[PDB]
């Protein structure tokens, strides 16, 4: 199965070429094929993808790197301009050369984790300007210099926290997700994020006690006791926007304990709640919807169609609601599973 | 003995070789008991000599089963119940073939009443050949051969319910082949046995094992003596 | 209708086993769904587990019984056999495979359904369209809320599957 | 097993006390074999089970035996040497009878053979009962009967000439209840048959052994075959 | 609780006879029930049951088969009906005259494995005809003239598989 995995990924290497604007490396991806290194037709299709990647960015640099690691057949160079290519668009988005200047050096020496390090750091960059966090621009820089994707991821993740800081109006938060960006833990940045989250969902349902478990776990660097915050946080959301005050108080004792098994099972609990009341409030909708229909029946008029029609679309509003409460309700159980 | 009395087993194989012409899963029942026979006399011709006695007994069953069963086949070309309970005696013995093949001990155990459920069978295929217009009975018959069916799933509940079933269908054979010749001093004489038979049958249907059986076998006797003057009431 | 069902919450309630009480219950629900479908193994299973008081037989049987309801209300005699195996067995892995099985089945059907029911409002539409009147309107709108009703249905459908699902994970 | 096939040999008494009313040895020999069966059914109640097995097996020979000698009788009430010979089986089977009360070993030896003694001898008397005005084999048959009294000499060269006298006597007495019931399709048929058993009695009085068994059993076969359309012929 | 489920499973045994067309299956049910075996019980439920899958395929074969063992309370014989009027019917869906026999033998026998065997061999052979799988269809006869279970539903999922193939 060498030979035919080489043809076949050799021929997506050409088609990849011949998409990113390369002949040559579709003709060295033939000659891949031909020989029969799935090695190297895999380096060509990654170079060819990096081609194509480096056109949708514009980077010649790294455009004539993926032709030479396609022509000779470097899998390492190969990842390394895709990644790096991947960079030049994050950075493009973002508008450091510096990280541009890292993503082609790291494309050049083919470090494939030098180029993800470039990656992250332009995403950590983006999202530092975003938030307006200069620390977490500054660890994405010293990371690109640097080349450490660790350190590029959190600052990634410490710029995302504190964006979810910020939004949240969590200092805390904020304070968590620069410490994280200096120590350049991802782990701590995550769970600063995630504690934000939960503050943001304490604060817009007045669970003080979730908030102040946010906190905590942002003054920890907990990312499963955030997360089970979180969920406990979304949970007693639910039960508020249903009436189960219980199931609330129920959320609060979970995300004291940092399990999110109970806080999933409880969310789950009021989604089928709620989904029992909207399944009802449905019922009443199709049988009013019915009923108009028949009055637009027995007297039809511009009263009695404009009557079957807004109720024809109550209905249909009513089940995109019924739907998107079913929808909260999956993804909750897919967070969980 | 082990190849003196496999002389008779011989000509059974020659008898149920010519007498059973359709029917494959016969032919090959057949070519199977020939090598087992041809296996008992390398084994008579060995040292093996009660080893040679053990399957020169075995397929001599066989071969008696074969031709029960060929003998019914001929008898019972007509009856899709006979037929299909034919196929599922042959079944039966291939897999008992497979298993004293394979020194399975349970040979004689099956096919114990195997031999036995091809013996009936061929007995209600003979009532059912020699019968004529007015079976009167073949739905009994049938009733039996349901019983011989139960029979069929009653193989630990059918030893003496076989010979109980044969013997009954030996009253009807005899009754069967008086009224055959007949044209009505037989019929007459074959209608009291065959009412004895009916009242056993129906005991024998009632739970009755050892009366019933006695007076369906009085019923038998009883017929035969009768068919004894009917032979040459014609 | 369970008074075998009755008398083991009684006997829990004097004992003060909520675990006996609560398996009563389930026991209770299980004997209401087999006697509302007709699964007369399941109603048995029920009582048998209320006078053993096993939660977990029971819940298995709620679920078998849920799941061969599904069943005839699609046609899926297999099922409810299958249904009536695993809660012979105890098991509510099974019993809720089934029921995915099934409501899979069902709304596969409700999906035709629908497509057949849009179709049909699109030509009402269509037909308001092309003439107009007293008539025209009536149809299209009783159309338009037929389609309504039969995504209610699917939706119900849909939602059952989903409790399902919930309940089994 | 030793009393669950022990009610077979049960209804076998049955039969045989109401198809012996005659020939007070059959009596005799009947009540002794129900003694026997009685000995063996005690010590089926006893722990001689083993015992118990091996005197209802031979009780069980002994009844098929003693029913062979009723039918014949009840088929040979006009044959002076069936009669004879009936007789001397009569004598033979308490002479068997005593030695297996002696506990002798070799009486499933004579008896080994005069059970197919028995079996010839009804079977004779069956083709001269089911005879009428054309005997047209009876000579043969007596030639038969002479080399069933030839095997009542050759009791060792008997064992396979029982049997293929008994095949012979099948293809006659097939062919006998073809013609009883016949007025002459059956006939012609039957005499296409009955000219390879004779061909074949001739090759068995030839000293052929395996070819002229072979004959005579593909022609009783054929006979048989012929025989399922003869009894839908009337 | 013995004598309680022998009376209710041969009440369902009597009506699932009379259903089939069996009111002397619907008396030894009752009789079943009398008496309080749970297990002739549910032959005789299982034999009523095979014949109204019978009477569904339409041979009388296993139909008396069947009533001869719920007169007698053959719980494996019923099964073994059951199961070979289930073959019965994917036989006559298929169109295999060779397992038919084999269903109608294995229900004789009670094999209740063979009955099985014979339902997976014709639905191999309906699976093989609709697949067009030859050595699927001579599997399917093979397993049915032998009475594997094993080999009839591997003769199923073969042409199943063939099937897949086919239209991948």
Known sequence: ?337 | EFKFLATEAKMLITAAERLAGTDPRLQEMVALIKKELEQAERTFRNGDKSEAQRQLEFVLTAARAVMNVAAAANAAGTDPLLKAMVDAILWRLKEAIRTFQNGDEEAETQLRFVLRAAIAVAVVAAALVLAGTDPELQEMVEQIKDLLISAFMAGEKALTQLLFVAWAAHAVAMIAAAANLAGPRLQQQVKEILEKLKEAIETFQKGDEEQAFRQLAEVLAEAALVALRAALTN
């Open chain 1, 1 to 337: 199965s060498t030979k035919e995995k080489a043809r076949q990924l050799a021929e997506e290497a050409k088609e990849t070429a011949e998409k990113v604007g390369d002949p040559e490396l579709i003709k060295l991806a033939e000659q891949a094929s031909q020989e029969g290194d799935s090695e190297k037709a895999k380096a060509i299709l990654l170079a060819a993808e990096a081609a194509r990647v480096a056109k949708e960015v514009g980077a010649p640099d790294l455009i004539r790197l993926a032709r030479i690691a396609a022509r000779v057949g470097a899998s390492e160079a190969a990842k390394a301009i895709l990644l790096a290519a991947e960079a030049a668009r994050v950075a493009k988005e973002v508008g450091d050369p510096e990280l541009e200047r890292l993503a082609l050096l790291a494309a050049v020496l083919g470090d494939s984790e030098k180029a993800k390090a470039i990656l992250l750091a332009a995403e950590a960059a983006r999202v530092a300007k975003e938030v307006g966090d200069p620390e977490l621009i500054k660890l994405a820089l010293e990371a690109a210099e640097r080349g450490d994707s660790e350190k590029a991821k959190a600052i990634l993740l410490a710029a995302e926290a504190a964006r979810v800081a910020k939004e949240v109006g969590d200092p805390e938060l904020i304070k968590l997700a620069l410490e994280a960006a200096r120590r350049g833990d991802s782990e701590k940045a995550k769970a600063i994020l995630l504690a934000a989250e939960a503050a943001r969902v304490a604060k817009e349902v007045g669970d003080p006690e979730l908030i102040k478990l946010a906190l905590e776990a942002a003054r920890r660097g907990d990312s499963r006791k955030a997360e089970a915050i979180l969920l406990a946080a979304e949970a007693a959301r639910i039960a508020k926007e249903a009436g189960d005050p219980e199931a609330r108080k129920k959320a609060l004792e979970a995300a004291r304990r940092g399990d999110r098994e109970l806080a999933t099972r409880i969310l789950i609990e009021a989604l089928l709640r709620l989904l029992k009341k909207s399944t009802a409030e449905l019922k009443r909708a199709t049988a009013s919807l019915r009923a108009i229909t028949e009055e637009l029946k027995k007297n039809p008029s511009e009263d009695a169609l404009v009557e079957h029609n807004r109720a024809i679309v109550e209905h249909n509003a009513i089940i995109v609601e019924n739907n998107r409460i079913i929808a909260m309700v999956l993804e909750a159980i897919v967070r969980a599973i």
